[PDB]
Specification:
The protein is mainly β. The protein has one domain: Neuraminidase, CATH 2.120.10. Strands 5, 6, 7, 8 and 9 form a five-stranded antiparallel β-sheet that branches. Strands 10, 11, 12, 13 and 14 form a five-stranded antiparallel β-sheet that branches. A four-stranded antiparallel β-sheet has the order 1-2-3-4, with no helix packed on it. The protein binds methyl alpha-L-fucopyranoside (MFU) (4 copies). The site of one methyl alpha-L-fucopyranoside (MFU) has 8 residues, from loops. This is Photorhabdus luminescens subsp. laumondii TTO1 complete genome segment 3/17. It comes from Photorhabdus laumondii subsp. laumondii (strain DSM 15139 / CIP 105565 / TT01).
Length: 342
């Protein structure tokens, strides 16, 4: 009961330029970047980071401006590689050990320490962190228990601490979160029920209320959200549609959540909040023919950009403009789906 994953991870460089990371046909992580912020078409082209990947990569900027990418290696350990100055000079790959059985996801703590979450060999959630802002060493791997059947998804909550969500072996959504307590720094796992058939994705509304999206057992998009910042949750509610990938979500320029997914015609579809109350738009097609979940990012000018694999395994993209969306164009490449779950 898994849905098609995204095939890249995107981030902005410190200067605003988007950069994407994916696994090529030779099983290496490759990357491609805007040569100046906000451009429609001026990209570097694809450059290899070498070696061998066995998961979807994940990138996050450090609090000093350096991008850092994470992937599972051929040994099933977590590996990482970083810019040595903002925008350039990759370190080469170094091991963070462990055995992971999901794709890794990255969080940044309010103090500037990166932290990675992944499923372990015992199907529990594990995590590992920088011990100082934007600097090694990293901690040992530590277990947060649970039984996971999806990638974890993480966001900062209204208390400024991480909250992590995953599907469990009852096919329901569960979460855990970090507190200020020394004795119980992380909560017990708590259920939000549901039957979900994709990876879940969490995001925060502009006012701090978390919201989670996932495909349901009827292949519609479903969602569940907090009734106030760091409060309890609604029931699961349907946004209808027929989604044939994991959903992706980002806040738009209007401060409203906007969800993207592949549809049953293999086009890219999207849907957005139209009020603060639970009002949403109609599902709306952006056309295209895609062979992955979408990945959504935002340019320095505030406009969204969506990436997805095309019919020939190249990376396609479509950009929001001041009044519309652009045409679909190709960034080339030959991407595989190396997702560690499926
Ligand atoms: C360090 O421990 C190893 O890596 C963790 C991330 C888990 O997969 C655990 O089951 C495994 O033995
Ligand atoms: C310079 O890069 C910093 O130190 C390295 C040794 C790694 O621990 C990395 O996570 C961190 O960003
Ligand atoms: C030092 O790092 C902090 O404390 C550890 C014991 C973990 O609970 C981790 O989530 C947190 O980031
Ligand atoms: C709460 O409802 C349950 O979970 C939703 C996310 C959907 O999968 C629905 O079909 C199922 O009955």
């Amino acid at each position: 009961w898994t849905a098609l994953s995204g095939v890249i991870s995107a981030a902005n460089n410190a200067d605003g330029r988007l950069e994407v990371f994916g696994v090529g046909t030779n099983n290496a992580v490759w990357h491609n970047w805007q040569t100046v912020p906000n451009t429609g078409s001026s990209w570097s082209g694809w450059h290899s980071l070498n070696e061998g990947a066995t998961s979807k990569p994940a990138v996050h900027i450090n609090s000093d401006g350096r991008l850092e990418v994470f992937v599972r290696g051929t040994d099933n350990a977590l590996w990482h590689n970083w810019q040595t100055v903002p925008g350039a000079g990759w370190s080469g790959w170094q091991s963070l050990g462990g055995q992971i059985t999901s794709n890794p996801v990255v969080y940044i703590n309010s103090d500037g320490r990166l932290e990675v979450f992944a499923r372990g060999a015992d199907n529990a959630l594990w995590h590992i962190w920088q011990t100082a802002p934007h600097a090694g060493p990293w901690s040992n791997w530590q277990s947060l228990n649970g039984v996971l059947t999806s990638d974890p998804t993480v966001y900062v909550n209204a208390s400024g601490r991480p909250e992590v969500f995953a599907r469990s072996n009852d096919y329901s959504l569960w979460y855990i979160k970090q507190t200020a307590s020394h004795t119980y720094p992380w909560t017990n796992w708590q259920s939000l029920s549901g039957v979900i058939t994709s990876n879940p994705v969490v995001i925060s509304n502009s006012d701090g209320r978390l919201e989670v999206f996932a495909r349901g057992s009827d292949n519609a998009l479903w969602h569940i959200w907090q009734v106030a910042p760091n409060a309890g949750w609604t029931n699961w509610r349907s946004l209808s549609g027929i989604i044939t990938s994991d959903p992706a979500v980002h806040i738009n320029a209007d401060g409203r959540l906007e969800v993207f997914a592949r549809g049953p015609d293999n086009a890219l579809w999207h849907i957005w909040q139209t009020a603060t109350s639970d009002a949403w738009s109609e599902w709306t097609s952006l056309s295209g023919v895609i062979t992955s979940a979408p990945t959504v990012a935002k340019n320095s000018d505030g406009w969204l950009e969506v990436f997805a694999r095309g019919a020939n395994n190249a990376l396609c993209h479509i950009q929001q403009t001041t009044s519309s969306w652009s045409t679909w164009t190709s960034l080339g490449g030959n991407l595989i789906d190396a997702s560690a779950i499926k």
